[PDB]
Amino acid sequence: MKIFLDTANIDEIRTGVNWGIVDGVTTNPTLISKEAVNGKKYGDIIREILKIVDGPVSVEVVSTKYEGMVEEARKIHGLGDNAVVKIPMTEDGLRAIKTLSSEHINTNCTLVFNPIQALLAAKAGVTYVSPFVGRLDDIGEDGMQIIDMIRTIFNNYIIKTQILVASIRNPIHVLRSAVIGADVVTVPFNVLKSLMKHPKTDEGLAKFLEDWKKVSPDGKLIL
Amino acid sequence: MKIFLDTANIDEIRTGVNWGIVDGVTTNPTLISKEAVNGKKYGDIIREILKIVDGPVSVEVVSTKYEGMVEEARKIHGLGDNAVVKIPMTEDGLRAIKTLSSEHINTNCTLVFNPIQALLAAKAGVTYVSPFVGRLDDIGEDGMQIIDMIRTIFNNYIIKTQILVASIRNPIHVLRSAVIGADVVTVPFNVLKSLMKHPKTDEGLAKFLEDWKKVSPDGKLIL
Amino acid sequence: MKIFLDTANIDEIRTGVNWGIVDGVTTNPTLISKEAVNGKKYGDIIREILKIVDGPVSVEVVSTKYEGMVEEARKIHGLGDNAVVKIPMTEDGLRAIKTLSSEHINTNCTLVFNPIQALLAAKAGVTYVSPFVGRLDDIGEDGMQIIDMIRTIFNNYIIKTQILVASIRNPIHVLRSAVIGADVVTVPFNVLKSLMKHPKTDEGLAKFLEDWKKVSP
Amino acid sequence: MKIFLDTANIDEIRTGVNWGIVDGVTTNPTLISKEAVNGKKYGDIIREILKIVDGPVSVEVVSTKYEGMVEEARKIHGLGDNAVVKIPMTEDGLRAIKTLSSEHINTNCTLVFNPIQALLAAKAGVTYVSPFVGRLDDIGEDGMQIIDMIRTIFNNYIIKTQILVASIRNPIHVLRSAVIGADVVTVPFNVLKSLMKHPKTDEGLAKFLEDWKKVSPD
Amino acid sequence: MKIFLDTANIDEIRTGVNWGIVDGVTTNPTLISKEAVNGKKYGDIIREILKIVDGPVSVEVVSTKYEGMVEEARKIHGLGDNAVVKIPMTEDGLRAIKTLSSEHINTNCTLVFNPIQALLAAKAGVTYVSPFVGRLDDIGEDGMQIIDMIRTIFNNYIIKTQILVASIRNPIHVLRSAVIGADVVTVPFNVLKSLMKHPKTDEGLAKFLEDWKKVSPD
Amino acid sequence: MKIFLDTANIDEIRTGVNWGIVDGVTTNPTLISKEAVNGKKYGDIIREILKIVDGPVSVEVVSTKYEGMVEEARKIHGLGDNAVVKIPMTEDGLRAIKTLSSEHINTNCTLVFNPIQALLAAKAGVTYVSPFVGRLDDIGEDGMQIIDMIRTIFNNYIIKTQILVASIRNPIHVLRSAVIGADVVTVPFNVLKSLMKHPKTDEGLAKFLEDWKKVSPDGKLIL
Amino acid sequence: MKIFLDTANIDEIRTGVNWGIVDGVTTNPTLISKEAVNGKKYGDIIREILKIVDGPVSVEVVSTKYEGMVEEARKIHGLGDNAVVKIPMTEDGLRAIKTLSSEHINTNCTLVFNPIQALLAAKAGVTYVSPFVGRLDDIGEDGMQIIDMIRTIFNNYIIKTQILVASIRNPIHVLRSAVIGADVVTVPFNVLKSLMKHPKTDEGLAKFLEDWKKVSPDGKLIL
Amino acid sequence: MKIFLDTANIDEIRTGVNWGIVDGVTTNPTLISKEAVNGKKYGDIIREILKIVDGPVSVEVVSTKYEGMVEEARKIHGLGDNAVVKIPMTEDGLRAIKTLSSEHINTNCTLVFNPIQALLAAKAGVTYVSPFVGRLDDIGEDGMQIIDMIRTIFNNYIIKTQILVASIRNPIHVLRSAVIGADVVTVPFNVLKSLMKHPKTDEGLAKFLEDWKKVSP
Ligand SMILES: O=C[C@H](O)[C@H](O)COP(=O)(O)O
Ligand SMILES: O=C[C@H](O)[C@H](O)COP(=O)(O)O
Ligand SMILES: O=C[C@H](O)[C@H](O)COP(=O)(O)O
Ligand SMILES: O=C[C@H](O)[C@H](O)COP(=O)(O)O
Ligand SMILES: O=C[C@H](O)[C@H](O)COP(=O)(O)O
Ligand SMILES: O=C[C@H](O)[C@H](O)COP(=O)(O)O
Ligand SMILES: O=C[C@H](O)[C@H](O)COP(=O)(O)O
Ligand SMILES: O=C[C@H](O)[C@H](O)COP(=O)(O)O
Ligand SMILES: [Cl-]
């Protein structure tokens, strides 16, 4: 399962990549604008992210109409081969995904809330579908069930579109995504960091290191 | 399923190895502290185990910082081809695993208590991941359920990291691990011994021998 | 299933109670300390909640010793008939619960993280037990499974202790609690606010008023 | 399982009750106005349905404010004891339901789309909750799953609120409602009529008529 | 589980009752007309069956129209209190069932092929519903699944209508009906007879006899 | 679950009753004739069994025709109120069971090999049905599945006829009968005796008694 | 579910009893042998436990013969109303249980390793049956499955004998027992202690106290 | 699924082999001692079976020590290419199996009562492992469940050791073994004899010959 960092913060990105557990990045104008402070320019942020990240970097199109979407998507693509254009599940979005797929521009269909929407995006040629699980949870539907059904559908037809679990709110979204077999999850840095933690890890390490001092007062390992 | 012996006790290790049922050994700083008493030095213990044992021998770094982990890992690796460097599930540990994996040094990520920690370790490139089933049992959670989930997750993504079930307390941990399909179990010597035994084995062998005496008073099979 | 509000924020409590969907309130030392700032005293905050809220209000002791817990519990109890004394799941806590129960003082055992802790609390005679689902989720364990097991265990032994699902983070904790059959959920204000809402209700409402304008301008 | 007819057509209603499979009626302004043709007073329609039906007749309030809802509800109640006041799942709706409940006026909470909304209505004391399964189907979610969850939840808490499956589109919504154990379904007349039919029933009827005219040509 | 004989042959009925495994009888025009020979008239056969059988005897109407159905039904009832009137699942049928049950006349709704039809008949007050499982098998639908669903639905609502599995073709329809918990099966005499048989029973009898001859050659 | 002893041996019966786990007896002419040795008369055997056994005692009718069955059954009944007349699943048997049930003579329908046969016997008023599980096993059908289905059928209709599992061959027939909820099993004395045995019981008792000698050399318990 | 303490250690018993979480005590000859050393007499130990403990206290006979079991059972019973006589699953043990049950002496049948042994003990009239889950685990069989079957069997027949899960080794035996619905578990002191504990309990309480200090430097709650 | 005959009775073996449904034979010290009576020597019985039976024939060592087992195994092996050396599941047995395996001598690990013992035998390189289902049944445990778990474990690790179900008591052990997918069953003669039979086959045969007599006297 790939993990994308949902942020535009370059320090967070570098740190996560160094942990060896970050495979790409998902952005939006809000996340980018957040970093555009103290001299940093909006466009400079996205360009640096595209440069330093080996993997996929998702960038949203703001145009809501077909022509604007494709023209914008082409400009985004021009910024880096690893750019992935984020396009909403709408009639014009599907048309744009079909057109962009033909041009070999990678795409990410967002605002997916049921499995058939996900399937339609895959049929139009989309690279990723991003169902928003936390937003389904918000309205009293278990959002992970939609991920499970999409996984089954995609498996049934050997669909190559990747499931990108989005609107992630907690570590159990991540656990269930992994057990289901979702291709990717995107998570904020704080969620990412929480994924490696457990109180028995902390307690266990403290005990090991206490015991080691019995055999090595300086706490060293000399070999 | 491989069976490793979870101990730093040399006598236990030579004995198990001779039964031909031991495929490797796992140590940790606590186990080594039990052994390095009354003049015995930890460095001598580690070298001796690497010597006696043909299979993988896990030895845990003690530094909690990236650079110290890597440095100690390289020294451990240098002691013999069968050495496997054990690294805790921490931020620095993941960094170390990524680096050491790129250097083709075999690694074992320890103090794992949930399936997502296991997945992160695998993503960082770890050779083995060691979830602690008995310590989960200790806190009122069925530890084997975590092994089942890790197996499912690893299968989903064709992950090559080996699942090494640790903190094993009884033969049912071993049985359930085998039925789940974990790659390795590491067991304490008392548990290892018990695996070979069953009262009906004892009783059946006694009866065979009693019946054989009717036909051969000396108890020999002369062909 | 009762629904309690998990906060010491008086504004939130007034708002939720005015909506008519709050059956009680839970507080803890963190929540209260959060509100007791810039001149506001924890004692006034506690008294205010007890008066505002008709239903059960849980207030947690801070002593870690048996004697201190029972002493504090009696003071909490004396603040009003709706006060429920929250007691942590510790050895001294179980002792305090047993004593408080025999004195007919309502209790709520908190910081419960597995079903056997919950059972121990019930055996001590606790009125409510509050397992923390969100904190289990935080450490990579599906917290709701613990609620499911506690419900089964309590059903097996006809245990009268109410299961009070706490550390709730989202409306699916709530949905799953109701499907399991937990007695009570306690929810943060942001969660409470969402429970009545659905986008199809909104859409349906809009459509209704439009249909009606046809029938009758 | 009770079956309500979701319309204001009096002929449809008589017909269904005569079949002995109609226990009540659910209306709304749209449905009532439909019958308000050729000299028929809108209010007359509602009043006649109320008179003829020996069971619950649901009539919706149009006010969105608590105070308008309860005044409107009391007036609706005054039209017949079998009147049930339909009120939407909103903050003011729940408040109104709680008030009307205490006044012993029967209520029906509508526009419910998940089980927790249904539980909130139950907790307000509502007589019926009406989840809209067809509208859930419309948006790619199997609406009957919500009914199944509400049935379990109501069972858990011995809730006396009746589950009234609404927005029904086909006979399988009905079959699944019955297998789940929902208390009530409300269906359009065309759905109602289709419920009694099966091609093997038609074939069997023709076969029995033919078999019979061997036994007796006359 | 009650067992009714699907016949109008008195000798078959008497023998079945003597085995203690027959609780009633189901007829139709064809079955009665088969026995209506050699002086015996249609009406006498039905009267003789009604008298001898200490249980329900189902007799079918031939009218397809409401009024005719009820007229017939009242005549059939007059023949004896144990008489049960078969009525098809149709609009007029439901109407007749509602009317007859209100008059405390027992009814059996036939030509039921799905669970909702069964529910409708129950709602109209029918005493028995008779889904035809063999005819469902005939068209590539596992008939017993329908009995299963009807059992679940009837259980959900504590429905007192009895499920009477009809169109039985083999002993597995019977086994499955009993495992499901259907109230009644009706079977021809030949199926009834087959129900008692098993080759290990026959083998065991022969062994008992041989074992006994050793113990007591006499 | 009641346990009947399938024997005519009076010593076995007394012994099993003393264990508190025998509730009645099932016989047949073969089992009775076996005991009719060294002066003991066939009829004396059955009469003594009827006298000493509090619970039910099953006795087979040998007549295959209705009139012979009922006349024989009445004579058996005349021997003791606890006599239960064993009658095969045949057309004449069903007629006899119906007649005998009316006379309040208890009956046991044997040679039952499917669930519907069992149901027919119950409808005729039979006290027990005896399906022969071992004989189904003999022909490659799992005989316990028939018991399970009969249990479900009987439960469905609150049938008061007792399921008497017969042709029992091993302790797992007994275990599965108990888990299913069969009313009764009938077993030979040797099977009965085997039911209380387990090697860990033997080993555990030996260990307890060895340890007790540490605190009580004479092995006594003086209180 | 009742919780008994499985020990003859007086200090452990007084401590557990004070936590108010202990509902009774189970002993056996081994446990008593651990305690009756250095001058301490077994008779004094038994009497002291019966004294300290308000709930049932099981004490095991040592004779292997019917008459000795009954005689010892009567002496045990005579020591106090809360005494429960423990009897092994043997031929003589079943005889003893039948007799003692008729005398209204509470009994506990021990060394049970399968569900049919448990059923036989219940049929003989035993008050409690004690299956040994850990010793089954020891021989490679999941001991809890036997508890599940006994629960099902006892439910089927409305058996009033209490299931007392014994040979408990860890908190998951306890958890599974509760979920199954066993009447009683008896646990070693170390296991008992662990049942109350969880790392998130410790961490949560520490944080509450830290946060409270912001509002009350003395850490008191003054109302 | 192969079917072996579990006996040292030469009459039974000849009879079963003549039926063409016996693929091999298993013996053990008890079975052999049963036949080696009244002048008949165990050595002659063993040699006779090896000659009569074309398929695998298992003969069990009697030494309990590693050296004695290997010595006896080599002698057994030298009696014929179809000989399989049966070795008990003990510490010395596992050592012997590992040595015998490296020497390309076929082995059969017996007295196995749980799936982990079976796994250990496989890890030592054993050709066949023989769990005893009937002896488990004897002690109140459904022996077939152990076969099901061993099949799962062996499937998980692509283990080539054949599962040889032993201590078989009835045809349902056999049916269940085949449905699970065990490689081999070994059955006593009384069981073997029953496997081809069914009362409906007999009846069907009788009916066929009667129908045929109509068609053609
Ligand atoms: O692509 C990223 C999405 O915008 C994000 O994951 C959704 O965030 P929210 O649903 O939590 O607002
Ligand atoms: O990898 C080995 C682990 O450190 C070890 O198995 C932990 O065992 P414990 O939980 O018994 O200390
Ligand atoms: O009883 C209430 C608990 O103290 C509270 O729900 C904990 O919530 P949190 O874990 O989300 O802070
Ligand atoms: O209460 C009845 C509802 O108004 C009706 O069933 C809605 O139907 P629709 O969702 O098909 O418009
Ligand atoms: O009531 C009896 C039914 O009419 C009968 O069983 C159905 O028979 P058929 O469907 O085979 O005609
Ligand atoms: O009533 C007893 C039966 O005859 C007996 O249990 C069956 O024995 P068998 O089937 O093993 O021959
Ligand atoms: O009843 C108590 C048992 O004798 C005890 O629990 C056995 O425990 P052990 O298996 O640890 O010896
Ligand atoms: O491999 C064969 C075993 O030794 C034999 O099958 C044991 O059979 P039994 O347990 O039925 O004697
Ligand atoms: Cl353990």
Amino acid at A8: A
> Which secondary structure element, helix H or strand E, spans residue F22, and what is its range?
none
At which residue do the structure tokens 């069932």 appear? E97
- Residues of chain G neighbouring H115 (CB-CB closer than 8 A): 140
Q: H25: which DSSP letter?
A: E
Distance CA D83, CA D56 (A): 6
Where chain D is broken, by preceding residue (C–N > 2.5 Å)? Answer: none
Q: What are the strands, taking DSSP E only, across A39-183?
A: 57-60, 83-88, 107-112, 128-131, 162-165
| Phi, then psi, of C139 in degrees rounded to 5 | -100, 20
| E155, closest residue in chain F (CA to CA) | F156
Contact B119 A178 (CB under 8 A): yes
- Residues of chain H neighbouring F203 (CB-CB closer than 8 A): none
Say yes or no: CB of residue A27 within 6 Å of ligand 1: no
- For chain C, percent helix, then strand, then coil, each to nearest 5? 50, 20, 30
| Phi, then psi, of A57 in degrees rounded to 5 | -130, 110
Distance CA G157, CA G177 (A): 20
The answer to whether the CB of H163 falls within 8 A of the CB of H147 is yes
> Which secondary structure element, helix H or strand E, spans residue E95, and what is its range?
helix E91-102
For residue C6, which ligand has an atom nearest its CA?
3
Contact B196 H113 (CB under 8 A): no
Distance CA H217, CA H214 (A): 6
Nearest to B88 by CA among A191, A203, A22, A189: A203
Distance CA H19, CA H196 (A): 10
Distance CA F205, CA H26 (A): 35
> Which secondary structure element, helix H or strand E, spans residue H196, and what is its range?
none
Distance CA C146, CA C116 (A): 10
The answer to whether the CB of G23 falls within 8 A of the CB of G185 is no
3-state secondary structure of A163: strand
Give me the helices (H) in A108-184, please.
Answer: 115-123, 133-138, 143-156, 171-180
How many residues comprise chain C?
217
The answer to whether the CB of B201 falls within 8 A of the CB of B14 is no
Domain that holds residue A148: 1-223
Q: Do chains G and H touch (3 or more CB pairs under 8 A)?
A: yes
How far, in Å, from the CA of A116 to the mean position of ligand 8?
A: 58
Distance CA F82, CA F50 (A): 7
Give Cα B30 to chain centroid, integer Å: 15
Nearest to G69 by CA among G96, G51, G40: G96
The answer to whether the CB of D6 falls within 8 A of the CB of D26 is yes
Angle ∠(B151,B154,B157) on CA atoms, nearest 5: 145
Residue A45 Cα distances to A55, A190, D145, D155, angstroms: 16, 20, 46, 55
Distance CA A92, CA A113 (A): 17
Q: How far apart are the first and last CA of chain H?
A: 42
Q: By the CB < 8 Å criterion, does H67 face chain E?
A: no
The answer to whether the CB of A113 falls within 8 A of the CB of A134 is no
Amino acid at A133: V
- For chain A, percent helix, then strand, then coil, each to nearest 5? 50, 15, 30
In b/e form, how buried is each residue of A62-76, taking b as 16+ CB within 10 angstroms? eeeebeebbebbeeb
Token duo for residue E137: 């098998």
> Which secondary structure element, helix H or strand E, spans residue E153, and what is its range?
helix E143-156
The answer to whether the CB of D186 falls within 8 A of the CB of D4 is yes
Q: How far apart are the first and last CA of chain F?
A: 37
3-state secondary structure of D174: helix
Q: By the CB < 8 Å criterion, does B50 face chain A?
A: no
Token duo for residue A13: 């990105």
Question: Facing residues of G48 across strands?
Answer: none
Token duo for residue H42: 């165990």
Instruction: Give the residue whose CA is nearest to atom 11 of ligand 8.
Output: H167
Where chain H is broken, by preceding residue (C–N > 2.5 Å)? Answer: none
At which residue do the structure tokens 């037990």 appear? C129
The answer to whether the CB of D124 falls within 8 A of the CB of D105 is no
Distance CA F61, CA F111 (A): 13
Q: Is C86 among the catalytic positions?
A: yes
Distance CA G6, CA G1 (A): 15
Q: Is H78 exposed, middle or buried (0-12, 13-18, 19+ CB in 10 A)?
A: exposed
Sign of CA dihedral G186, G192, G194, G197: positive
Q: Which residues are CB-neighbours of E46 under 8 A, at least 6 positions away?
A: E8, E27, E32, E57, E59, E76, E79
| Phi, then psi, of G41 in degrees rounded to 5 | -95, 145
Sign of CA dihedral H128, H130, H131, H137: positive
Q: E181: which DSSP letter?
A: T
Question: Facing residues of D60 across strands?
Answer: D86
The string of DSSP codes covering A60-71 is E----SHHHHHH
How many residues comprise chain B?
223
Q: Which residues are CB-neighbours of G203 under 8 A, at least 6 positions away?
A: A199
Strands E83-88, E57-60: pairing kind: parallel
Distance CA H183, CA H196 (A): 19
The answer to whether the CB of G63 falls within 8 A of the CB of G69 is yes
Q: Which residues are CB-neighbours of F43 under 8 A, at least 6 positions away?
A: none
Resolution for the entry shown, Å: 1.9
> Which secondary structure element, helix H or strand E, spans residue B199, and what is its range?
helix B199-213
Nearest to C129 by CA among C111, C104, C143, C102: C111
Say yes or no: CB of residue F134 within 6 Å of ligand 6: yes
Q: By the CB < 8 Å criterion, does D140 face chain A?
A: yes
Q: What is the CATH number of the domain that holds A186?
A: 3.20.20.70
Nearest to E28 by CA among G14, B203, D205, G29: D205
Active-site entry in H34, H86, H123, H200: H86
Sign of CA dihedral H119, H122, H126, H129: positive
Instruction: Give the residue whose CA is nearest to atom 6 of ligand 7.
Output: G167
Distance CA E167, CA E28 (A): 12
The answer to whether the CB of G14 falls within 8 A of the CB of G20 is no
The answer to whether the CB of H89 falls within 8 A of the CB of H120 is yes
The string of DSSP codes covering G89-103 is SSHHHHHHHHHHHHT
Token duo for residue A201: 């890890």
Q: E10: which DSSP letter?
A: H
The answer to whether the CB of C126 falls within 8 A of the CB of C107 is yes
Distance CA G197, CA G175 (A): 14
Question: Facing residues of A86 across strands?
Answer: A60, A108
The answer to whether the CB of A205 falls within 8 A of the CB of B88 is yes
The answer to whether the CB of C120 falls within 8 A of the CB of C89 is yes
The answer to whether the CB of G114 falls within 8 A of the CB of F198 is yes
3-state secondary structure of G27: coil
The answer to whether the CB of D19 falls within 8 A of the CB of D193 is no
CA trace torsion G36, G39, G44, G49 (10° rounding): -50
Active-site entry in A34, A65, A86, A197: A86
Distance CA A139, CA H214 (A): 76
H21 CB neighbour count, 10 Å cutoff: 12
How many residues comprise chain H?
217
| Phi, then psi, of A221 in degrees rounded to 5 | -125, 95
| Phi, then psi, of A88 in degrees rounded to 5 | -75, 155
Nearest to G186 by CA among G219, G162, G218, G158: G162
Distance CA C87, CA C91 (A): 11
> Which secondary structure element, helix H or strand E, spans residue H85, and what is its range?
strand H83-88
Question: Facing residues of C60 across strands?
Answer: C86
Residue E159 Cα distances to B15, E117, E155, F64, angstroms: 71, 14, 6, 44
The answer to whether the CB of B45 falls within 8 A of the CB of B32 is yes
**Structure determined via:** X-ray
Question: Facing residues of A108 across strands?
Answer: A86, A128
Instruction: Give the residue whose CA is nearest to atom 11 of ligand 5.
Output: E167
Distance CA G44, CA A98 (A): 88
Angle ∠(C152,C153,C156) on CA atoms, nearest 5: 85
| C138, closest residue in chain A (CA to CA) | A171
Count CA atoms closer than 13 A to E104's CA, side-chain side: 4
> Which secondary structure element, helix H or strand E, spans residue F45, and what is its range?
helix F42-52
Q: Do chains A and B touch (3 or more CB pairs under 8 A)?
A: yes
The answer to whether the CB of F13 falls within 8 A of the CB of F49 is yes
Catalytic positions of E: 86
Give Cα F205 to chain centroid, integer Å: 31
Distance CA A34, CA E132 (A): 70
Q: For residue A26, which atom of ligand 1 is closest to its CA? A: 1
Distance CA B102, CA A91 (A): 46
For residue E173, which ligand has an atom nearest its CA?
5
Strands A184-187, A2-6: pairing kind: parallel
Other chains touching E, judged by 3 or more CB pairs under 8 Å: D, F, H
Q: What number of H helices and E strands is found in chain G?
A: 11, 8
3-state secondary structure of E11: helix
3-state secondary structure of D154: helix
Distance CA H30, CA H62 (A): 11
Q: Do chains G and E touch (3 or more CB pairs under 8 A)?
A: no
Nearest to F56 by CA among F22, F93, F21: F22
Nearest to B118 by CA among B139, B148, B89, B86: B89
Give Cα G193 to chain centroid, integer Å: 15
Nearest to D179 by CA among E133, B130, E145: E145
Task: Give the number of domains in chain C.
Answer: 1
Distance CA F152, CA F201 (A): 35
The answer to whether the CB of B114 falls within 8 A of the CB of C141 is yes
CA trace torsion D155, D156, D162, D165 (10° rounding): -80
Token duo for residue F98: 């119906």
Contact H142 F169 (CB under 8 A): no
3-state secondary structure of F164: strand
Say yes or no: CB of residue D106 within 6 Å of ligand 4: no
Distance CA A131, CA A111 (A): 6
Distance CA C20, CA C25 (A): 13
Q: By the CB < 8 Å criterion, does A104 face chain G?
A: no
| C176, closest residue in chain A (CA to CA) | A142
Say yes or no: CB of residue G27 within 6 Å of ligand 7: no
Q: By the CB < 8 Å criterion, does G149 face chain F?
A: yes
Distance CA A19, CA A193 (A): 10
Q: G164: which DSSP letter?
A: E
Q: Which residues are CB-neighbours of F191 under 8 A, at least 6 positions away?
A: F168, F169, F170, F171, F174
Q: By the CB < 8 Å criterion, does E140 face chain H?
A: no
Distance CA G93, CA G70 (A): 9
Token duo for residue C214: 């046809």
